[PDB]
Amino acid sequence: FMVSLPRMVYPQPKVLTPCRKDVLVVTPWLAPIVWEGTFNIDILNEQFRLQNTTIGLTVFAIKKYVAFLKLFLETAEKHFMVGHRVHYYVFTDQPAAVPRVTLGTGRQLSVLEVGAYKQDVSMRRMEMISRFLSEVDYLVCVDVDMEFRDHVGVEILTPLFGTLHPSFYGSSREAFTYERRPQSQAYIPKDEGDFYYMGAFFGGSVQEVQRLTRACHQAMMVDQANGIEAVWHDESHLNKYLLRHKPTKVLSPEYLWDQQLLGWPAVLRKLRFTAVPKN
Template sequence: MKTIKVGILYICTGRYSVFWDRFYHSAEEFLLTENDIEKHYFIFTDSEQAEKGYRIHRYFKNSEGFPSDSIKRFEMFLSIQEDLKYMDYVYFLNANMNFVQKVGKEILPVGFKSGLVGVLHPGYFQSGKEELPYERNPDSKAFIPNIEGHSYHYFMGGFNGGKTDDFLTMCLTCSNNIREDAKNNIVACFHDESHINAYFLTKNILILSPEYGFPEDLEAPFTPKVIILNKAKHYGGYFIKEYANPFLLPSPFKKKNGFGKIKSKIKKIISKIRKYLNP
């Protein structure tokens, strides 16, 4: 029986190192536990908390804060691509993701031409395309045009992956696009997430539902398999300021012209979700 090697990319610099232990144990219990799968963890951190081991590979990375640690993640991954090439599949997950149910081989993009996997954003999976917060600046490399008849989805930046070569190709393209934007003094509205969505737009990818990434405190129409931990709830001393100042909403969710209570409720829900997803 051939062993399938799966790499898990994980960034826990600065205050985010507190999530590592909980993430690791949840992944060991629930993620790809099949006998023919061998998981390896590739961790970027400035903490000694994550001990090295046969399946735990640690790379020193100073915390640069947000958004640098988010938008530079593709550069991080490419910096260890020689190590990653020993893996059959590679996945990235945000630091505060936690597995709570079995997540098996259904996340492997077998039979998908792109070789890639994306998770629908929990804040927008029931939204119309006019509400999706794509980058709308036509000068940005993350720009998404309005293509008539096209099926639109908005993917979260906190959980994606796929076949190693295909994932690294995505990382290279996104990294180059981010650099090109920077030369033109452009930063995409939702950073790496915007560039991932632009890359996925015309690709045949495996689409996972928000069951694979849903905020722990919000009511869901399903039972989540992966939850997004409330950072302030679990580690308030580290994240209390962030808890008090959640992300501003993209313009489609701002109240204007008296849209009323429904939009107001949506705004509150999305702001809570953004608070969870802010890396």
């Protein structure tokens, strides 16, 4: 059950005035594409706070990538779901290397120990993700070699979402780096494909994320038994999944950007969550 919103004063939406004219803001299956200027965060904050929404954030920090945790968590504290309940799940082979980061109220961090792989480390995330049902309402699954630079909030939440890959949002579908070998479960032919989604940021309700990760894990297992590894590993399988199960929101590349690589184009009003230079 969902109680009434309170009285709120904000600018009237204008039917004959689009917010953004420069970009597609709804997919052909009527999912919002989330760009700055498309949402009133005050309305959304009210809607999700009234549900006492808890957001789980999963991140893997294996071997040397423990080095990225401090900046990742400190900036998440400043920018990610502020005002909402947050539960960080840090999966690592080095529990003692996890930095002590001060968390705001209503926010918690769990360290989950795993084994380390010698492709595999990136890939096995689907298996490891696939407790959450009892503890959080939504799950967000991100890369750790990243930092938050601006608001990432409840505007992303929905049953199932993907994020536009910053290198491909302007590309035609034959240019997308999908798995092209019919022998792989991740196969997508040249005349198929909506978008190229980034493996570094996806999520949804716990139920939908578990479905997704289960499906990708099963498909990767089939590929392995067939002696094939998809070209972009888990990302290839994510793309196949979101092709056949359309996401209910798509995040713009504001939500996954690399400023060193790609600068700050006109179409991006904010750079929210960005790659941290590495070697």
